[PDB]
Amino acid sequence: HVILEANKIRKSYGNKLNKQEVLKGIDIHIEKGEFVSIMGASGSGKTTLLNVLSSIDQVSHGTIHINGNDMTAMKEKQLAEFRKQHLGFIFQDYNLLDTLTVKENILLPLSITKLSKKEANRKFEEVAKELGIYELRDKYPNEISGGQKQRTSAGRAFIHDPSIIFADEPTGALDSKSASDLLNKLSQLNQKRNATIIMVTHDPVAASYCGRVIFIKDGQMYTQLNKGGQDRQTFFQDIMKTQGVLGG
Amino acid sequence: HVILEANKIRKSYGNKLNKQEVLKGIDIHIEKGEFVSIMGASGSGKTTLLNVLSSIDQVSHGTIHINGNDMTAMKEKQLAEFRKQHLGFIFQDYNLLDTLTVKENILLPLSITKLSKKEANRKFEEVAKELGIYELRDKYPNEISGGQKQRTSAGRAFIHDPSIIFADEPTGALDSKSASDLLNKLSQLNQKRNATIIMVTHDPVAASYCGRVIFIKDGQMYTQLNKGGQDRQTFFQDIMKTQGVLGG
Amino acid sequence: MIKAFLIERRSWIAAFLFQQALMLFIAFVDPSISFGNVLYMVYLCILFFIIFLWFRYRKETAFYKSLKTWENNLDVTAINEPETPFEAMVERSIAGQTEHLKQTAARHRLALENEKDELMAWIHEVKTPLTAMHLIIDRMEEKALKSQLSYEWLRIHLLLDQQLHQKRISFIENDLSVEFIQLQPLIFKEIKDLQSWCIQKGIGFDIQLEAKEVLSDAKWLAFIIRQLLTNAVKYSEASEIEIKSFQKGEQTQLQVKDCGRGIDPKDVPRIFDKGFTSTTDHHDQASTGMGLYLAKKAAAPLLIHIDVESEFGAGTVFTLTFPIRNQFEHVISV
Amino acid sequence: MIKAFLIERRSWIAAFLFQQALMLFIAFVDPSISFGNVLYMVYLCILFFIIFLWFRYRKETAFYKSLKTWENNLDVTAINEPETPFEAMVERSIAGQTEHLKQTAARHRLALENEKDELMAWIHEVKTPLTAMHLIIDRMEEKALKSQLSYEWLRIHLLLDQQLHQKRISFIENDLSVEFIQLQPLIFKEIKDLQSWCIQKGIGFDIQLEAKEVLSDAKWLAFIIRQLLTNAVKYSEASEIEIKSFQKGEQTQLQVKDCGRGIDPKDVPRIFDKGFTSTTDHHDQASTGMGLYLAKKAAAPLLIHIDVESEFGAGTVFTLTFPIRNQFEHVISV
Amino acid sequence: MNINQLILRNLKKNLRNYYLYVFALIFSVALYFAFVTLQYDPAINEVKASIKGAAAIKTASILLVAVVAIFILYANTIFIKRRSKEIGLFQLIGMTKHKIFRILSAENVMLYFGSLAIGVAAGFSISKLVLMILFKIVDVKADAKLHFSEQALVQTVIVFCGIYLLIMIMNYTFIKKQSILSLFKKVKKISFFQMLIGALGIVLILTGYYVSSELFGGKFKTINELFVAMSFILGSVIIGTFLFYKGSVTFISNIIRKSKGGYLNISEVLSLSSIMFRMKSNALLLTIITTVSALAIGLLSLAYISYYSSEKTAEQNVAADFSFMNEKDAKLFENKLRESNISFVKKATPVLQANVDIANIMDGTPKEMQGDPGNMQLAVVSDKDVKGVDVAAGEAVFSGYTDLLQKIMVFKDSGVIKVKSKHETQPLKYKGLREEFLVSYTFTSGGMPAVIVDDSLFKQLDKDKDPRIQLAQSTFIGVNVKHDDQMEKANELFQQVNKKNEHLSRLDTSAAQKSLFGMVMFIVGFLGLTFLITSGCILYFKQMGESEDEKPSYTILRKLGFTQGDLIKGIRIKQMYNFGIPLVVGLFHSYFAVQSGWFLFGSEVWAPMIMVMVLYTALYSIFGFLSVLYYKKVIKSSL
Ligand SMILES: CCCCCCCC/C=C\CCCCCCCC(=O)O[C@H](COC(=O)CCCCCCCCCCCCCCC)COP(=O)(O)OCCN
Ligand SMILES: Nc1ncnc2c1ncn2[C@@H]1O[C@H](COP(=O)(O)OP(=O)(O)OP(O)(O)=S)[C@@H](O)[C@H]1O
Ligand SMILES: Nc1ncnc2c1ncn2[C@@H]1O[C@H](COP(=O)(O)OP(=O)(O)OP(O)(O)=S)[C@@H](O)[C@H]1O
């Protein structure tokens, strides 16, 4: 059961004298309930790929099919309304509005639907107690630590149970303990409620929590690893071994 | 001949209620003419250390002695001239002026020091031919590519003859070939004029061009590796062996 | 830009100035109205009119300038966002024509794909009965008739295989595969495939290979060697072909020799040209000259160069200079 | 559309009103200028401005409406000639886009036509070697092997002829020829062509032609008859195939009958479907099954009706109705 | 390169972003030049008023300078706010602040002096329309002419060169406060103290309004407690306004927001979460704006009332059409009028100054004395002269209203007018009312209403001849006129008579009041319009800066997917709630300030207040619309 499907997508920046090509013929096949990671260096088109896969940017060529709907024909407003309802986003950086509390920040996407009052106050607590922020419900974002804001952002992204969740280096601003805690909670949330997460990283430690790793280099995918029955340590060692060949 | 000498520096962001420490008792000894790098996953406090060491931000505790002169006992003006004479900076994003051509954009720092035109012209020509962007002088920065922009930004920092170069991750916006070429040219410029280039990276293949590597974990250095007679292929493998341990 | 706006909105300017002209004229013939006190009104009106025109010009001459920029140069998305209805009922037509062009291009692509699929099906349908015919006629009891039929069948098979390679040159890039291959089995298989021609021409085979292991794709290298052998057989009559493989330093090479008529030095580099043929001999009119070109093109992605040393009256020598072992490792890193 | 015009030009009307207000105010304040004459001037200018607005709408709101009409239509001549530079830019942009689309379509059509020509050529030098092989092989003395080889060669030649006629059916319209055709020589030649199939399968033939003169195209009529007989022979085993031609009414009708297995009535109407292969036997899957479709399609321009009367377990009756001779006058006239 | 070339390129590239700045400078310069060129204009001396006319313009200019200085200082933020990464990069390269200051101040000078040059030309063009308006207001039929008045040019140049020093001072601090870290890149729970301040502000405002409304009802009829009440009202109103714009908006905002359990939508997020936290940071500006606007409107209304109340007070001040103090001068005037062929009906009406008792008629308060309760210099007239008001024995009719006396002194419904003579008494009763004063203000001082008694009663009164307070001229010598046919020539001959101008006239004094109060109203209206436009433009400038720190907030949520049409719908409500609170507060302040205008000097007008309350709303709506357009433009270019 494929959820996302791309066929030979391309993308370029600039014009005339500074027209550079970033993506060159990429094929992607993500399934339902999978937790996939694309790993590459800092010059590879990871953010560009995540932008064009979620309809934030526009491809020069190719075709993208999310959940059976062709997204190369919607103009702008259909794409925005599709993003508003069916997708979730987590970013490495500022996600929370400074003038709202935690509750009013992670109850924002539910305002489109008008899901009563108790039908929203129950779904808020059900996801808040799963991340340990239920005692931080009436605190402004300038009164909480670094990892608590990221957990709050993840709770906001998971509340309306979208089809695909796009994460761009979620643990790029946390120390070791906070990063490990957030990654473990993300994995548990994935396993409990079946959700497809596509994450782009440049850290093998954060990529060892996944189930399939795709190695990108200059807009071309050429390696795939599958976890299988191995635990986290063996998968981490295998990822380290694979990363050593593409760099030497 | 030690040129930089930190001693038990500390730093903590936040005020009163919410305060979090970043640097925790770091001792650093750096020699002159040494191409030093610092490796660590994002969030370990690297750019904070580079801000502290470059005398851009103030410390909570500790003293830094660069070339004998004390750093924690000077005023804003004294720091200003000391930084103007003895420091150079390279960052990830090129900081260029679009209204100026490449030549007059590099020559901006050298046009305020009351110097004859011929000497500045000779210095610019020497630097440009060393880097290889000589033919792109009269082309405005919106008619060239990213690698050429980054090479111009790097060459701006090598024209007023500084003593220490403080470089952030300079190849974080370039592809593989451009990154390799820029790193090779930096290592070549280090060998002619003894500039103590200090680079902060999180990239295993970027720090294999150096002479010593220092590992940071959460605000405290862990290990050190020396180059010796390895040929950048054994040194890279050694870097990967320690990176794996520090990671998982 | 200024002239276009001024000439387009000329009726409005004329209408605006007509009232002031009328006031100035009327002030003469009216004793109760003074000229000096109405010239002040005229001045105060003309100042505001000039300011209003300057304000309107910048706002109005933007969408059409964007369209003029979009005309032919580049930046197909140089159009701006319309605000007035007249600028919307133009973008409507522009978008309609663009979408029609895009769907026509999609239709052309689908037609090309359908043609490729149909011609692949035809290739399968015309490759089935060559094999059926060969299997049926692999029962014959006479000598000369069997030799003639086998020669004709081998010629047709070679032509169809060359055509198939000519068509598969498009996807040869994706079909490159590296595995350990022994030269002796493939050479013996090629000799078996070319038994009838060598039997008729009395052409022997010599296999003296110092190195029997090569680093290249099996199918494409087999095509190259088969084409070289067929060219040598055509160019050499009643002569034995020497096949030797030796290690030229770090590059493995395979050498083929013959005692044929050879190639004139004036056309030695031109044998590998597309569709090239030799005008020296009358019987060369039946050769399309496609095996050499296809083999050389297929050897390029494998980092293999074909060396030719042919002399008139001596023969034709072909060398396949296989690359160094260390060069087939960049497909995973770069 | 008048509402759009008013909402498009509100600024100039506002400017005119402000000019009138300024005139009135300055006339009111100054004591040397009467306040009675200025009111009359204002009223006259308002009325004349209304008339001028009417004329301006009439002269302005044409090009955009014509463009809106043109974009949703099957013709291109619904656009008016340019009258101002602002419309000239839009016209030039539309012309450029249409020219780009036309040139792109023309180049792709030309490239596809050249590819089809290369395909048809390749068909020719695939079919020629079969003829050469037959010419070489028509010297055997044995019976069974010769009969099997003849059967195979006839099958392959019929497939190649079907491919050639499928390619030619695009230009069959311009290649139609009207001439007298003698049924008996054509049927004799067709029977002699399939002599090997009848010998191998033990299938008899009957020659009884009440009508001997027909008017059609010889090549395509012979093609249709040939594949009708071929299908009858292939789909029958040792059955008597009868050919009957009778003159009924004013139209000449020719019928082909075989006593084979036949076609099940469920799939009898589907025999004319393109690429139709019967599912009751696996041996029939390899058959192309296109010759019947080609015959039916090529019979339409010649006003020939290829009817079917097939009963399962009895056989299939193929009726060829030659059109009236007086009907060919329209073809001759055009 | 050369630094001057860099400055020139910066100017030529950034000139497209500085149009509001240039427009504001041009507008200010033009207004100041146009207003000041009247002071030195020789034609202004034709305004014959009590005050000179070139002396009030000086103080008005002193106020105008302060009005425009803050406008320009608030406009300079448009120029200075954008350049932050520029200074960061210049400090990264190595330049000190002493060179960045000069680099960024070498083009502000060029823009400022270009605007100064242009605004003088545009201020000279409209220098005649202003003079014509002023002449029309005070009704002068002279001719206006164009004039340059180079002294005004010199004064304007000096004033704006003085303001540029403040501009440089404010540039320096902003340049100083930036660092090298600017190249890359508060809100809290409400305590209990604010919960108290918010209620205190509303309480103070309401108490001030209630106390002020009782003043117009008739209470506090004594000078002593009037000033205490006035001072208390002013203090309470101002303190309540400050506490309203500090914690009384966050109070109600938090109360409303807490009703929703923490489940808002995009409109509420964009409106309430900003109004709660950003309005309190501007509390000393909104207070000044509202208070000054209310004061200006009230003063203008008072001036207009006094301007249209001139003919009545001219008629009251001089009882007759013409007044005299000598019999010979009046006879000479009559002799001059003999050839004028205008029938003079001069009547030296004899009125006896008989003191009466009106202490009991007063219905005020015992602390209200106004001197002797019943020993005023009141006068009584007979029935033969005023035959219309026929009065029987023991009755009287007062002839006069005297609004100032009416608001202080209250007459009893059935009071008795007892003539407190030397020995006899003549109690009288009140039947009718009149407003005609029988003598001019020279003889009646504060204004004694004429008393009409029975003819025989007046015969008894003037045969008594009480030796007490009595007019020096018992028979007032005031010449009257026939129907209004040739009054202008009569006044011309009157002026020809007394070269010393020792007498009075009706139409002569009917012009001094107009010529003074019209100029006062002109000055007040000019300053009020200037301030009214300036305050709204300042609010617009402030709003133009909240969308640039919110640019990241508009960039995000759009990746989440919200569409620009959903992001501007909340801005349309934010601007309503932003521009409508000061409007309502100022409107109520103006309404309560203008009620004191006709509490004392008249009864009611209602005519100009409504007309002035429409321009206020129109300007506020225009600036709100402009702010909405700017935020739409900012939002559009986020993603
Ligand atoms: C940007 C700031 C520029 C403001 C400069 C505007 C010029 C000075 C401004 C305001 C003056 C306010 C006048 C006070 C209220 C006027 C009411 C009044 O006085 O009552 C009567 C009416 O007064 C007038 O006639 C004056 C009529 C216009 C007065 C207001 C003019 C508004 C000017 C603002 C817009 C025009 C721009 C002027 C400067 C370019 C006086 O009696 P009369 O009608 O003259 O005699 C009748 C016999 N035919
Ligand atoms: N100005 C700041 N205020 C508050 N926290 C900060 C600030 N700068 C950094 N931090 C925090 O300090 C921690 C370490 O961040 P950095 O100092 O940037 O280390 P770093 O990630 O190695 O540097 P870069 O930018 O990725 S090369 C993180 O938890 C940040 O959130
Ligand atoms: N707006 C842009 N204009 C021009 N070039 C761009 C732009 N955005 C990205 N690029 C180029 O695209 C390259 C790769 O894209 P990136 O988005 O930077 O990939 P990335 O760096 O791996 O993503 P992150 O942010 O590190 S997770 C960069 O090195 C730039 O040279």
Numbering used by the authors:
A (entry chain B), B (entry chain C): 1 to 248
C (entry chain E), D (entry chain D): 1 to 334
E (entry chain A): 1 to 185, 193 to 646
Published text:
One such mechanism widely found across Firmicute bacteria involves antimicrobial peptide sensing and resistance membrane protein complexes collectively known as Bce modules. These modules are composed minimally of an ATP-binding cassette (ABC) transporter which defends against antimicrobial peptides without transport across the membrane, and an interacting two-component system containing a sensor histidine kinase and response regulator. In this module bceA encodes the ATPase domains, bceB encodes the membrane-spanning permease domain of the ABC transporter BceAB, and bceS encodes the histidine kinase that phosphorylates the response regulator encoded by bceR. Previous studies have established that BceAB mediates resistance against bacitracin, likely by freeing bacitracin from the lipid target undecaprenyl-pyrophosphate (UPP). To understand this critical membrane protein interaction and the molecular details underpinning the Bce module flux-sensing mechanism, we have determined the cryo-EM structure of the complete BceAB-S complex from B. subtilis in nucleotide-free and ATPγS-bound states.
